[PDB]
Design a protein around this nucleic acid. Structure first.
Ligand SMILES: O=c1[nH]c(NCc2ccc3c(c2)OC(F)(F)O3)nc2c(F)nn(CCO)c12
Ligand SMILES: [Mg+2]
Ligand SMILES: [Mg+2]
Ligand SMILES: [Zn+2]
Ligand SMILES: [Zn+2]
Ligand SMILES: [Zn+2]
Ligand SMILES: [Zn+2]
Length: 1213
DNA sequence: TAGGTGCGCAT
DNA sequence: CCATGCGCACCTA
């Protein structure tokens, strides 16, 4: 429905202009953000006119909900400064929608262009629009196809595929690669002269620019050198007709008078031709000087003078690869040569070097002749010193896409130097199936035509498949940089490129170099670019207009070539290129899991062997049914390899002595329990006898867990009965019908995570396992910082709403690549990684031990296995506790009543709430020591394992406790054990009632996804009818209505089991528990208040607490560690200052009832130097107090900290 | 260079 | 008024 709020506005100032707190002002813009709050519902709209952004405030509620982002609104209200927000705000008594016509492509339906150069926000910090919206715009405009060519990557390929599907637009998959010429010769006119005895005319030119085509030399210098000594010198001035531009007068120390009277070039050129006879020409960047000289020669029909040449730049690059910059000044400085830039100086400088370079070439290598100077070219790190140029690579078919993935992977893994580089030889080998285009003004064809001439461009263009010409608006930065003098030269360059292409019979296309969608989005790019400072060369000049142009805009931009040629290169040739490519699929459709022979049989055998050992050869019918259904779902769907890999990883972890916990719903699987993957038993509560295999199950819902069951002795024999089972259906893990892909996230120890990764490498091979890769983008904090820095540098004053709009526009742009925390991606050995994704190094770190996938794992994890082998501190803490006490972690009673007391109060510990500042003794207990969870425990007083699982679900779920169950419990409507804590509980409760398995599963899925309201009326109706028909209370359905997100029961069971295992040691072995906690979990210690005693710890805690809610993350971590230290002190244990001999590098030591702090506790004692003092103390004592700093590498400062705190006092020096 | 600190991302 | 944890960017002694 039409959205209107107040009086009909008469059917508007630029928001930028309005600054007074005036009233009765019209203002219409675009709504880029919406937010309704509940008081009188208050409306806060951020609206923009692309000039500035203001905030419309309104106090109708149906309209409030109806207004949406992307709308156009006119308010005509009163600007009132007063607000919660300091900025001026608009109080709009009426807001009215307005219809804005979008950009349209006015060309005929069949005569639409294809945009072949598109940059998405996956071009790192270069483009700002998602490929999805660009593809949608192309679809709306009627374009038959569009290309996604990002700068060196293909990370937008999956999103581009989805968008092209949705929009009915063909996607051409390409990349803007940086290609480096594999072989750049050192010697040009190959000849068999002897370098040691030859005569060299080391020459140089001072020019009015860099374009040999469009400018000319003004000074010609040269020195004839022999045996390294000068023989003759030829210096001359050439006068251009035009006065020297101030740029030249400064770059080159030459003024118009300085060359006001000089010989004509024809004469100077003849003089140099005679002077440079039977000699080996020499130059720094000899291509540049030789091109200038040869163009000048040809200007007067003089012979090209093709004597042997040497380019000192290439020779220096080949001889001294260790160097980083090879310009003349840098090289002259390194080799101690002197230079002011006048041609004479340049020449003498090059000569003084060239002698050294030729001597090195003759001695250090076998290059005694001119020809031999080219033998070893393009071999080794040559790619690293070369200057890359832009090329466009498009996949023509699926094999072309695999080749493109290989090229990207090699440019990321083998030829990376500050950018992904492709050597031209590699691009030549894979060219079939690939379309190569000249890219932009940074491509080599445009560079040659604007700086070297038509013949060099027609030779380079021989290698491309099509030639790209962009509108003059894209090239404007060249005219601003003096690279192209004026628009006439630009038009000439573009026309020559069109002709060169027709001459060589190549497709010439107009591309556009799109970097953002609309002309108003340019600002975003600017901000991003500005954020790079001097790192980005684009900051030197102004950015072009690289928005997405329609067909008519492109035809207008190329009208200077004539209507026929423009219509050809814009519409016909682009669509020809599009038609050349067949439909390509960058992402697979099915899941390709690895194949391990005998996996289904192995999983079944393991499960049944463990089940027999635990429940006797005749298995209980309950266990028989469970195992049969689980294994039929697993082995039936080909999911046994997932279970087998998890089993092997956990088995190897257990052999090394580490417990593996789980996250998610793996604990819902009884096959996961029997195979050993998970510790959670999802069976119904029950007893089983460790000795005689007797078992007894309670499927009546009388106990929440087998742990809550009372102690009992075996009827068959005298042994005690082990109680297990938590009533977790497997449908939560395998879904109803068991067709769901199992997902087993395992929390291995932090120490052991690398071992598990390497074990995956062993299981599947080094070439088929890759660390899952993530793409980190510009988020709100970074975008806000970018906008603030931009406004500071440009000295503007943005309104908070604009700033927020500019931050939004620049958000989501790719900023870096990293690794997923625990995700290893496994490729089936019958395929290769390039069937799925390119590869790279995380953050482009070539020293990385693992390679990550180029694509974000979200785009590929449906087609290959992503092993979540995560690291958690709990298995580390439990391993340390086992080390410190010998107790096996799995023998710890998780049903102990005394331990559960810690969840009621601090007394079991032996301390008060008054002393430990906490009602509960769960401080330092994982997932239960937080203030929120501690408050929930205080308000609920759990006393059973089922109630602890409830607490986990309620504390971690969304909308499950704050407004849904805190009240129900406080008012006695339901007990803690009755409210909805975990998603499995909904199904369990409904099944225990009259509801059926399917209905209960559907209800639980709808509630856990927060779709109770989102589902249609008919569905909600069926569910409500069934629940009420079966005596399901009203408060239970009300709860379901308010739940946004719920967590699995197996997840909570695993985390509660770990917490109980740690709490056992906290209660019965306090010193061991505190030692393990501080050694593993605590990283930032004051240690001074800690070493003092309880009073200093309490004072530090009070300081942090009085710092208030506005406290740093470091302060909050310090508060946590200080709370633990205070609790430990209250219980009679104490900390001790570090000791050089006693203290460990990273672990607290136990001595009596005292914890000796490690070196890493000392403020900044560092960790490497920490191990150092450990290494030194075994060589010998630390005598003189100076010896310590000397060997250990202890920084005086730290020595001071130890000096005052008593550590070094021992030292008798 | 090695910590320290944000900050983004993920389970 | 969710917990925990990893990894890279950037700054600084
Ligand atoms: O957002 C998440 N928060 C948490 N908090 C920690 C937590 C600990 C114990 C729990 C628990 C949550 O839940 C439980 F009730 F099951 O027992 N964990 C995850 C995760 F593994 N994946 N995701 C993302 C899926 O949304 C989350
Ligand atoms: Mg020079
Ligand atoms: Mg997973
Ligand atoms: Zn770019
Ligand atoms: Zn480019
Ligand atoms: Zn480009
Ligand atoms: Zn028995």
């Amino acid at each position: 429905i039409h959205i209107q709020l107040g009086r009909n506005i008469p059917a508007t100032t630029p928001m930028i202009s309005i600054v007074e707190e005036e009233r009765r002002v019209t203002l219409e813009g675009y709504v880029f953000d919406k937010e309704v709050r509940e008081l009188r519902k208050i409306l806060t709209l951020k609206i923009t006119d692309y000039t500035s952004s203001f905030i419309v405030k309104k106090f109708d509620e149906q309209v409030f909900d109806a207004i949406s982002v992307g709308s156009w609104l006119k308010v005509r209200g009163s600007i009132q400064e007063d607000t919660f927000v300091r900025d001026l705000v608009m109080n709009a008594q009426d807001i009215i929608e307005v219809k804005h016509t979008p950009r349209k492509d006015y060309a005929p339906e069949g005569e639409k262009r294809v945009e072949l150069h598109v940059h998405s926000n996956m071009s790192t910090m270069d483009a700002t629009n998602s490929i999805s919206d660009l593809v949608a715009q192309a679809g709306k405009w009627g374009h038959r196809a569009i290309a996604i060519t990002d700068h060196g990557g293909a990370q937008a390929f999956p999103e581009a595929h989805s968008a092209g599907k949705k929009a009915g637009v063909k996607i051409l998959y390409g990349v803007e690669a940086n290609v480096v010429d594999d072989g750049v010769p050192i010697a040009y006119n190959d000849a068999h002269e002897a370098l040691s005895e030859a005569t060299y005319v080391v020459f140089a030119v001072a020019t009015t620019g860099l374009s040999a085509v469009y400018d000319t030399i003004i000074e010609l210098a040269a020195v004839k050198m022999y045996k390294g000594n000068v023989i003759e010198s030829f210096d001359e001035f050439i006068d251009p007709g035009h006065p020297l531009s101030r740029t030249t007068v400064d770059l080159t120390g030459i003024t118009d008078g300085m060359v006001r009277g000089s010989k004509s070039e024809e004469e100077v050129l003849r003089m140099f031709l005679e002077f440079s006879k039977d000699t080996i020409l020499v130059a720094h960047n000899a291509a540049f000087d030789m091109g200038f000289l040869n163009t000048s020669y040809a200007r007067y029909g003089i012979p090209e003078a093709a004597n042997p040449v040497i380019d000192t730049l290439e020779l220096a690059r080949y001889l001294y690869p260790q160097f980083k910059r090879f310009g003349l000044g840098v090289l002259s400085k390194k080799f101690g040569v002197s230079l002011e830039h006048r041609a004479i100086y340049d020449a003498e400088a090059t000569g003084h070097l060239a002698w050294i370079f030729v001597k090195e070439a003759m001695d250090n290598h076998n290059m005694l002749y001119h020809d031999q100077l080219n033998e070893h070219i393009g071999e080794g790190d040559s790619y690293k010193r070369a200057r890359p140029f832009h090329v466009t690579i498009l996949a023509k078919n699926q094999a072309g896409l695999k080749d493109l993935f290989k090229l990207i992977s090699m440019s990321n893994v083998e030829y990376f130097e500050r950018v992904p580089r492709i050597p031209r030889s590699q691009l030549k080998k894979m060219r079939e199936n690939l379309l190569i285009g000249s890219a932009c003004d940074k491509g080599e064809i445009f560079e040659a035509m604007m700086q070297k001439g038509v013949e060099e461009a027609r030779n380079r263009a021989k290698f491309y498949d099509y030639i790209e010409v962009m509108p003059k608006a894209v090239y404007a930065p060249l005219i601003e940089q003096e690279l192209v003098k004026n628009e006439h030269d630009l038009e000439e360059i573009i026309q020559n490129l069109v002709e060169i292409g027709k001459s060589l019979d190549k497709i010439v296309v107009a591309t556009g170099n799109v970097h953002y969608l609309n002309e108003e989005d340019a600002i975003y790019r600017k901000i991003l670019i500005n954020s790079m400072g001097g790192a980005n060369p684009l900051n030197r000049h102004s950015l072009p207009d690289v928005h997405f142009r329609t067909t008519d805009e492109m035809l207008t931009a190329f009208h200077f070539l004539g209507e026929e040629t423009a219509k050809e290169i814009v519409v016909e040739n682009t669509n020809k290129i599009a038609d050349i490519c067949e439909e390509v699929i960058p992402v697979k459709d099915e899941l390709y899991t690895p194949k391990i022979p005998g996996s289904e049989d192995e999983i079944s055998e393991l499960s049944y062997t463990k089940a027999k050992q635990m429940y006797g050869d005749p298995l209980p019918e309950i266990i028989q049914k469970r195992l049969k259904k689980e294994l039929n779902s697993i082995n039936g769907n080909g999911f046994s390899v997932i279970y087998l890999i998890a089993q092997k990883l956990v088995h190897k972890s257990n052999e090394d002595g580490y417990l593996v916990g789980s996250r998610g719903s793996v604990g819902s699987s009884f096959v996961a329990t029997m195979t050993g993957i998970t510790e959670v038993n999802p069976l119904a509560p029950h007893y089983y006898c460790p000795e005689c295999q007797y078992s007894e199950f309670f499927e009546d819902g009388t106990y929440g867990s087998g742990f809550d069951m009372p102690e009992k002795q075996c009827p068959k024999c005298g042994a005690r009965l082990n109680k297990d089972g938590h009533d977790i259906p497997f449908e939560t893990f395998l879904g109803f019908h068991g067709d769901k892909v199992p997902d087993i996230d395992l929390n291995f120890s932090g120490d052991y995570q690398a071992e598990a990764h390497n074990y995956t490498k062993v299981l599947f091979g080094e070439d088929y396992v890759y660390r899952a890769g993530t793409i980190g983008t510009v988020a709100d904090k970074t975008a806000y910082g970018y906008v603030k820095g931009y406004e500071r540098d440009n000295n503007l004053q943005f309104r908070s709403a604009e700033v927020d709009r500019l931050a939004k526009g620049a958000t989501g742009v790719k900023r870096t690549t990293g690794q997923h925390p625990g995700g290893i991606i496994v490729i089936p050995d019958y395929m290769d990684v390039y069937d799925f994704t390119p590869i790279q190094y995380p953050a482009d770190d070539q020293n990385s031990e693992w390679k990550t996938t180029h694509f974000d794992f979200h785009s590929i994890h449906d087609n290959v296995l992503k092993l979540d082998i995560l690291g958690h501190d709990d298995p580390t803490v439990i391993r340390m506790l086992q080390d410190l006490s010998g107790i096996d972690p799995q023998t710890i009673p998780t049903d102990d009543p005394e331990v559960m007391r810690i969840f009621a109060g601090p007394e079991v510990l032996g301390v008060s709430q008054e002393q430990i500042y906490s009602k509960t003794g769960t401080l330092g207990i994982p997932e239960f020591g937080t203030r929120f969870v501690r408050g929930m425990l205080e308000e609920t007083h759990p006393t059973t394992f089922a109630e602890l699982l409830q607490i986990s679900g309620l504390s971690h779920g969304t909308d499950v406790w704050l407004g849904n169950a805190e009240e129900l419990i406080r008012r006695g409507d339901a007990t803690l054990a009755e409210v909805i804590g975990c998603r499995d509980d909904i199904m369990v409760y409904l099944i225990h009632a009259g509801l059926d398995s399917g209905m209960a599963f559907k209800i639980m899925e709808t509630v856990r996804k927060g779709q109770w309201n989102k589902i249609p009326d008919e569905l909600r109706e069926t569910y409500l009818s069934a629940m009420k028909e079966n005596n399901v209370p009203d408060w239970y359905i009300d709860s379901c209505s308010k739940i946004k997100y719920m967590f699995p029961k197996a997840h909570a069971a695993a985390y509660v089991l770990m917490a109980l295992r740690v709490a056992y040691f906290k209660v019965y072995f306090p010193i061991l528990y505190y030692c393990a906690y501080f050694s593993v979990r605590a990283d930032d210690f004051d240690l001074v208040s800690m070493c003092k005693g309880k009073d200093a710890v309490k004072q530090a805690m009070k300081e942090i607490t009085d710092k208030g809610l506005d406290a740093s993350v470091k302060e909050k971590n310090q508060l946590t560690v200080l709370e633990l230290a205070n609790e430990m002190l209250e219980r009679g244990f104490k900390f001790g200052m570090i000791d050089l001999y006693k203290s460990d590098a990273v672990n607290f030591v136990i001595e009596g009832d005292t914890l000796i702090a490690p070196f890493r506790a000392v403020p900044s004692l560092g960790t490497n130097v920490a191990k150092q003092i450990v290494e030194a103390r075994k060589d010998g004592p630390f005598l003189s107090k100076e010896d310590l700093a000397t060997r250990g590498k202890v920084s005086k400062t730290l020595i001071e900290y130890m000096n005052d705190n008593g550590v070094l006092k021992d030292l008798p020096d």
